[PDB]
């Protein structure tokens, strides 16, 4: 750490739409509104045929 | 070939000069060096002057 060359850097609150709040030390200044966090991504949660469509299509 | 001779004359006013070579194509600015002057016995500013 020098002085007076690094970009300006304070604590920031961020809020994800799944009801999540977290506490992140950053540079943009203003607080963050987040689309998706690690607690609600489909991959992270884990939530991520021809004969059957033929039978359901042309069932006899 | 392109380096040409210059004389560094003293600022002590005694008319004493060293002589060097300089590349004026690369560096148009003059040359000032604190070097020894034998008649005033002091290290004094020698500045560039033409031959």
């Amino acid at each position: 750490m020098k002085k007076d060359i690094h970009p300006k850097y304070e604590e920031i609150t961020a809020s994800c739409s799944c009801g999540n709040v977290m506490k992140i030390r950053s540079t943009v200044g203003h607080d963050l509104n987040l689309d998706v966090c690690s607690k609600c991504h489909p991959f992270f949660t884990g939530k991520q045929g021809r004969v059957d469509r033929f039978n359901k299509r042309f069932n006899i | 070939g392109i380096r040409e001779k210059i004389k560094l004359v003293s600022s002590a006013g005694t008319g004493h000069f060293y002589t060097t070579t300089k590349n004026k194509r690369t560096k148009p600015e003059k040359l000032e060096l604190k070097k020894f002057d034998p008649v005033v016995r002091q290290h004094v500013i020698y500045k560039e002057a033409k031959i």
Binding site: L34, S38, C40 | -
Partner: protein, 177 residues
């Protein structure tokens, strides 16, 4: 910092459990995390290097090296010592805050995200990864960017092998696929 607390409080003894070591500092640590961005078009325009350096300062919270060419290469029209990249190195609480930023913001924001490759290790336990669009990063805002840009990330650790490194990253729940 809270990731470091998570490390020191649970990850070390978990590593102890499944690896049956003799030392709590046989349990591996993260040696350094360095961020590179090769801006090789600086020979076309040195100013976009300055814009890119500002962007990498924005993500890093840290002034970057403007790194120059090691040896002149004919094919890319570069001379030795020509500034063609930007880099930072991150250590300590900066590891932990930036790693928190990554694992809790950036990888949810990857466009068409399906997890990271576990085969990205270099054979010595150190991990590397490539980000294509820095706009997934909230440290930079949308309409003030000039060009689409990417970067690459390396986490160098003291782990002696790839299974060691992937076990450590799975302890940090790094999204392998």
């Amino acid at each position: 910092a809270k990731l470091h607390d998570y490390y020191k409080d649970e990850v070390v003894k978990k590593l102890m459990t499944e690896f049956n070591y003799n030392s709590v500092m046989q349990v591996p640590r993260v040696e350094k995390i360095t961020l590179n961005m090769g801006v090789g078009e600086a020979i076309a325009d040195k100013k976009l290097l300055d814009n890119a350096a500002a962007d990498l300062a924005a993500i890093s919270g840290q002034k970057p090296l403007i790194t120059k060419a090691r040896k002149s290469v004919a094919g890319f029209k570069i001379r030795q010592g020509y500034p063609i990249g930007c880099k930072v190195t991150l250590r300590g609480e900066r590891m932990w805050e930036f790693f928190e930023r990554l694992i809790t913001i950036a990888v949810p924001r990857i466009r068409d995200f399906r997890g990271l490759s576990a085969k990205s290790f270099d054979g010595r336990g150190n991990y590397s990864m490539g980000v294509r669009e820095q706009i997934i990063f909230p440290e930079i805002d949308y309409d003030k960017v000039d060009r689409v840009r990417g970067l690459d990330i390396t986490i160098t650790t003291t782990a002696k092998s790839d299974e060691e490194g992937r076990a450590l990253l799975a302890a940090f729940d790094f999204p392998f696929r």
